[PDB]
Design a protein around this nucleic acid. Structure first.
Ligand code: MG
Ligand code: MG
Ligand code: MG
Ligand code: ZN
Lengths: 100, 221, 66, 140
RNA sequence: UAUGGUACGCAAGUCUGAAACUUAAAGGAAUUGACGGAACAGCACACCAGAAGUGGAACCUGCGGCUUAAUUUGACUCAACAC
């Protein structure tokens, strides 16, 4: 019972692909296999934002607080446990560009 | 409290070199002279990391350009500084980094006639023309060979524009948008590029400044 | 800091809280310092449309429900 | 009276700029002010200073207490505004700043401290030495 | 695996490679259940806003122990125990 046709990794036309340590655990995982999400968040709770934007010395800031950039790479055990990815029915299992 | 730990500390106002505002930007702390320790001489090598908070008119939009300065001189309770480095905020970088285009990077080593050896890193990105939203479908990559020609060209041009200018000149040009314009004009044949950037500048080998040239660097209007 | 604003509910929007004990609500202000401003607030207790609410901060605005 | 061994000549218009290096770990938080050079250190506060429990070292309560101590101490050095340089342990380790990050940043301004330019400097390998985990990471 | 290798290897071992004996199953995909220290979604005074409280006391009345000649006996999570 082959489960995935992909077999989980996006890799074809090569023998080997570089291994990446998982953010959460640090387990080595295939770069194709890895669940990788790029995150641009803000360093600060919106309330906290109000508080700081009051006190910003340079008034020449328009959204003059930096965003936090993360390239997040999960091993499978981790990205499942941590709900980044979750179990779906056989038919949906092949759906490719899902979010909102 | 008993004996505030800063009891012995003298303060100095930083002064910026010729491309920047003559007005002091920050202030620094140092311990008083001990009769061995000479107050002014403990500061000979210090390094200042600032934005352009340093160009009064033009500053406010560029929080993206970091400038390192090094203190060449102490004059009368205020510390003069010469050029040390150029750089970029994390933000202004990961700002520019997008999937589905090619990331070009170009490193160069150059000499001023001022006697400086500099290392300039340049950054550039593939510019999509085709008018869609760049995506998994909208792939923008440029051929590796085109990348190589782009390096060769950028690099060459910089070494040329370096050898003919003083470090005052060179730094002024470097901070601002001149080189980006020119670089796009050279590069465009090979491939259209977007947000050309000078990622960093390092100063490899710096001569010491005669009183003359350090006066001519100061030269403020 | 004591400063206070009267807030009248235009719409009852959601229902929310871990136990589900709170109501989400849309609000028009009557203070006179800020009039006709609209806000989204989380209210504990039972509310209809067109109640009045005593609000200590018109800056805190509640995260909408999805 | 008050002898502040901070800077000689100020005004009410003037801004006095210190720099705050803030390190947030899953295990602790650091609020550290220096001059624009980074050489001369002004104030130093760790979470562990502010709590006796090893586990609370990182927490927001600790970060808060830390922050207010720092602020109180800059205030007498006549310092209005800190630039902020934020850091997680970084390098090969995690790049997500710890819990104390936000809390300390807030409590700093909450305390009536102006806030200058903000940058994240977290150490970022072009490439890495090998990670402290197993080949298989932390199991459990 | 045993054994034989004018097959290899410094070694680890690699390659070649049995039979006696024993056994009716082992095995493949898929269905339905049941289960899960997986994901999601319902419903109930389950929890939530509350109240009256038991648990603490004396006593009453059940269980269990323990004594007893005998302390008849069934019934132990809701789903035994003023049954
Ligand atoms: Mg292989
Ligand atoms: Mg194409
Ligand atoms: Mg570890
Ligand atoms: Zn993991």
């Amino acid at each position: 019972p082959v489960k995935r046709r992909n077999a989980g990794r996006s890799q074809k036309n090569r023998g080997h692909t570089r291994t990446v340590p998982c953010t959460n655990c640090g387990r080595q995982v295939a770069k194709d296999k890895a669940v990788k999400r790029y995150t641009v968040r803000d360093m600060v709770d919106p309330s906290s934002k109000r508080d700081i934007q009051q006190k910003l010395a340079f008034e020449n800031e328009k959204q003059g607080i930096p965003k936090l950039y993360v390239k997040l790479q999960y091993c499978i055990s981790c990205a499942i446990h941590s709900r980044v990815v979750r179990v779906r029915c056989a038919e949906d299992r092949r759906i490719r560009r899902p979010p909102i | 409290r008993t004996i505030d730990p800063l009891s012995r500390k003298e303060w100095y106002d930083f002064r910026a070199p010729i491309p920047f505002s003559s007005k002091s930007f920050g202030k620094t702390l140092v311990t008083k002279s001990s009769g061995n320790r000479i107050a002014s001489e403990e500061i000979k090598g210090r390094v200042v990391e600032s934005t352009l908070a340093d160009l009064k008119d033009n500053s406010n939009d560029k929080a993206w350009r970091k400038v390192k300065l090094v203190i060449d001189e102490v004059d009368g309770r205020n510390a003069k500084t010469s050029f040390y480095g150029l750089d970029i905020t994390r933000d202004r970088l990961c700002s520019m980094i997008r999937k589905w285009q090619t990331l070009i990077e170009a490193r160069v080593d150059c000499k001023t006639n001022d006697g400086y050896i500099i290392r300039v890193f340049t950054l550039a990105f593939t510019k999509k023309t085709s008018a869609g939203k760049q995506s998994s479908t909208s792939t923008c990559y440029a051929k590796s060979s085109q990348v190589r020609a782009i390096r060769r060209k950028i690099n060459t041009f910089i070494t040329n524009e370096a050898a003919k200018l003083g470090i005052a000149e060179f730094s002024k040009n470097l901070i601002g948008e001149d080189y980006t314009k020119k670089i796009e004009k050279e590069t465009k044949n090979i491939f259209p590029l977007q947000n050309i950037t000078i990622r960093k500048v390092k100063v490899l080998k710096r001569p010491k400044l005669d009183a003359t040239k350090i006066a001519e660097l100061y030269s403020h209007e | 800091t004591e400063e206070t604003t009267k807030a009248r509910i235009m719409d009852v929007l959601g229902k929310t809280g871990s136990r589900g004990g709170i109501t989400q609500v849309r609000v028009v202000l009557i203070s006179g310092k800020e009039e006709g401003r609209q806000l989204i607030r989380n209210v504990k207790g039972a509310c209809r449309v067109g109640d009045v609410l005593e609000l200590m901060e018109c800056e805190r605005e509640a995260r909408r429900l999805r | 009276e008050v002898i502040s061994y901070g800077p000689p000549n100020v005004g009410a218009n003037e801004n006095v700029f210190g720099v705050c290096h803030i390190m947030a770990t899953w295990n602790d938080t650091f609020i550290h002010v220096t001059d624009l050079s980074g050489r001369e250190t002004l104030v130093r506060v760790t979470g562990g200073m502010k709590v006796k429990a090893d586990r609370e070292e990182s927490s927001p309560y600790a970060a808060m207490q830390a922050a207010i101590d720092v602020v109180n101490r800059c205030k007498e050095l006549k310092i209005n505004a800190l630039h902020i340089k934020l850091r997680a342990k970084g390098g090969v380790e995690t790049k997500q700043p710890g819990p104390g990050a936000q809390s300390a940043l807030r409590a700093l301004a909450r305390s009536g401290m102006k806030i200058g330019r903000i940058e994240d400097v977290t150490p970022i390998p072009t490439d890495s030495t090998r990670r402290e985990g197993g080949r298989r990471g932390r199991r459990l």
